[PDB]
Amino acid sequence: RVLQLTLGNSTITTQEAANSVVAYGRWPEYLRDSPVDQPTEPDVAACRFYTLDTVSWTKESRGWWWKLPDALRDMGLFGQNMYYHYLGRSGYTVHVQCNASKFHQGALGVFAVPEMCLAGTSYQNANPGEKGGTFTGTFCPVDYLLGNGTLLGNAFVFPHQIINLRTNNCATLVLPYVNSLSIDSMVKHNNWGIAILPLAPLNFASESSPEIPITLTIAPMCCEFNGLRNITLP
Amino acid sequence: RVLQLTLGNSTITTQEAANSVVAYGRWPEYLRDSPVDQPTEPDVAACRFYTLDTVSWTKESRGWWWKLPDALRDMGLFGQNMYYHYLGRSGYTVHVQCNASKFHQGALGVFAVPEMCLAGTSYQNANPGEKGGTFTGTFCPVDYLLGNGTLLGNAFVFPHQIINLRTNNCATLVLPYVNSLSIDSMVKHNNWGIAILPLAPLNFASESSPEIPITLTIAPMCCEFNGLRNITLP
Amino acid sequence: XXXXXXXXXXXXXXXXXXXXXXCXXXXXXXXXXXXXXXXXXXXXXXXXXXXXXXXXXXXXXXXXXXXXXXXXXXXXXXXXXXXXXXXXXXXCXXXXXXXXXXXXXXXXXXXXXXXXXXXXXXXXXXXXXXXXXXXXXXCXXXXXXXXXXXXXXXXXXXXXXXXXXXXXXXXXXXXXXXXXXXXXXXXXXXXXXXXXXXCXXXXXXXXXXXXXXXXXXXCXXXXXXXXXXXXXXXXXXXXXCXXXXXXXXXXXXXXXXXXXXXXXXXXXXXXXXXXXXXXXXXXXXXXXXXXXXXXXXXXXXXXXXXXXXXXXXXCXXXXXXXXXXXXXXXXXXXXXXXXXXXXXXXXXXXXXXXXXXXXXXXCXXXXXXXXXXXXXXXXXXXXXXXXXXXXXXXXXXXXXXXXXXXXXXXXXXXXXXXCXXXXXXXXXXXXXXXXXXXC
Amino acid sequence: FCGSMMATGKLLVSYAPPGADPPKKRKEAMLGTHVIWDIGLQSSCTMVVPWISNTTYRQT
């Protein structure tokens, strides 16, 4: 069975979004009552599954990472909205599938990390846009650290899902908007940050594709923006 | 008394739109029933009063003219819509005021002309964009002809209104969409064309502004576009 | 980033024929409506001129003959009238107005005409030069419709070896001709010991080899940039970008680098509208182009100067496609050499240098570092039929050109010409005349 | 698709509507309308392109 999800001009097929995890079990929604609260609401075409360029997981692949909204600082509309607008706030459904054959043992951890400050500093350095940033096992923040001198084994606190190949081959984190504010400048501040690390090292059979692809399908949800609308009076 | 008309981010003050004329007494509206008819409906921000650069009417001014939609081939949004879209159709309220002092005798005729083929040939030649095109009294199509070797005196057939200065100083034509089709390529085909000619020659008192300004405030109404939306099926 | 690969770099189209300059872009050169390609025709030692834009329409300062084509990646140029002024390098772009340019190397279109003979005009050495022990035997090879213009200097009935440095000039736009002024420099004792120092020129004009032997006994928008700048290794090298209008362009004060042995390339486009700029990916850490909000001026500075970053920077503040703009192209050099004043040596026009209807009476501005030797005539008064030769490069990193101003044989007593050899580098003014010798 | 039963991948099929230009990069095409058809899940992507024309009868 395969569900075919649609968001206007975009469509994604999904085996079974049974293993969907909403971070902190909070579904993303708009700003509740708590016009005057300037909720410019363009939930039309900026809410379509976008697809980042796939990375090629290999034997010695350390890991990948993308900041959000950053990633979509170009995905057409949404990327636009993050300029004609000063303020905004979107949740996001991140949908990571990585099709592989039944002969590829391996396992990835997808970690959504609120305010993912990757340590070891210059805007561009920490914003790899749409191609994401990679880790290293010794610029590239240390993998088993996630920049921040932490022991990997604890990552699992952060909304996470494990793509153990000999089972599900997809994963879907659902991040809701999270921040110390109620709305904010979507451009200069990346609420989330998705890191994908290989837990079990990718291994396969003799003559088989030695580099399985993994795609990210980030769809901004219930997004909104500030206001330019002023007011007049007679 | 002065009415203050609003269309989102734009606002126009108008003395009294009492002398408003709808061409052929047909108000512009959308495509009636006569989704399947692919009526992509973005009647949001493309429907705001735009304002063309004012022309300076003088003694020896012959006349001016603008093709529509052409004119708005740049007025932000609407101009955009005429590219991301293949098909479209908009009416328009054209609102021509020309503030002058009580000491300026003069009179203009505003003529809306469906399919205004200005004769004497190269796209750019017949599409002066937003600054409009001017006439001449002998490139510049002959004024008392409107290109087409016609006698001026008959213009009045075409939806028209006369700005006789010693009376109303504004004029508002309301064109509805007109064409041999039901929808069309807004870009390569100018449904209307507004020509403003001075009937009574502009004259004034000794030391007074010798060049009264006339502004055009074209607001596209009930506009719509073709479709990119395809369809899938299991 | 739509590219371009201008094939057929070398092409010689004579007058009366039809030239061409094809384009082959890797990516499309049109998206919205019109094309982003174009047809250019830039001569040697010039700025970013306006020939064509949008691949269909024509730019300001051009004729109607130059047509348009290439509504895609595969574009080309058009010319229905070839001449001597048609000699200009053509390079199709892939941008209309946006600040994202990346053009190809170049597809030059040379000109030709009926072959002519190259007369030998050998002059004697100056006195002020000979005193210093810089006796050089000059020989001009101008007024010839052939590229190959050799000048082999002799000494005591034997051709010299490792004692000459000739320099050929550009293609004169008069009747498709060229020039070449060579000089055989030697020591004082060397020139004194030698009886005669002849020089032959066997070009593709005459049957035999002609020479001239003489005994060494008796005989919309604009932007005026600054001049060239001199600096050392690991120093500063910027360029002035000031306009003579209200302000700059809408998009931004774009720049196009022009280094030695290259056509054109985009580096970075800095705006003078507000503050934001936009550069290319390749150039990084050496395109510090800012904006001066004082008198409507821009900048084109580059830190950590290298041999590569050393290029003539300017700004072509073009708003529309037809009415464009360019700069003076203020050269920014980076080498290790001391500056020196250009001393002008007077070379008299003898009967040997005379061709029965001419008398080459010019000067010699040798021993001048930081190449800047422009030899004018009577403080830049008359300049017709004369062409400026290219400066040669020495091992020491100096420059010594040879400018020969043609004159009348009879007119060598009444009037007198003075060639002002200026040098802004060393800032030494000098204007030596050229009197006639009896011999 | 009519390749291995074990083979697997994802192809993006995109409908560039008329007037525009066919997309040349996958990216541009993902911005447009487009199915992301997983080889491995369904051996066949179907998709009805829609009817359009100003001149409400296309000329052959």
From Swiss-Prot, chains A, B:
Q: Where in the cell is it found?
A: Virion; Host cytoplasm
The annotated consequence of residue 160 to G/T reads:
Complete loss of VP0 cleavage
Its quaternary organisation is: Interacts with capsid protein VP1 and capsid protein VP3 in the mature capsid.
Relate the protein's function as given in its record.
Forms an icosahedral capsid of pseudo T=3 symmetry with capsid proteins VP1 and VP3. The capsid is 300 Angstroms in diameter, composed of 60 copies of each capsid protein and enclosing the viral positive strand RNA genome.
Q: Indicate what this protein is called per its UniProt record.
A: Capsid protein VP2
Give the classification, highest ranks.
Answer: Viruses, Riboviria, Orthornavirae, Pisuviricota, Pisoniviricetes
Q: Which residues of the full protein are shown?
A: 81 to 338 of 2209
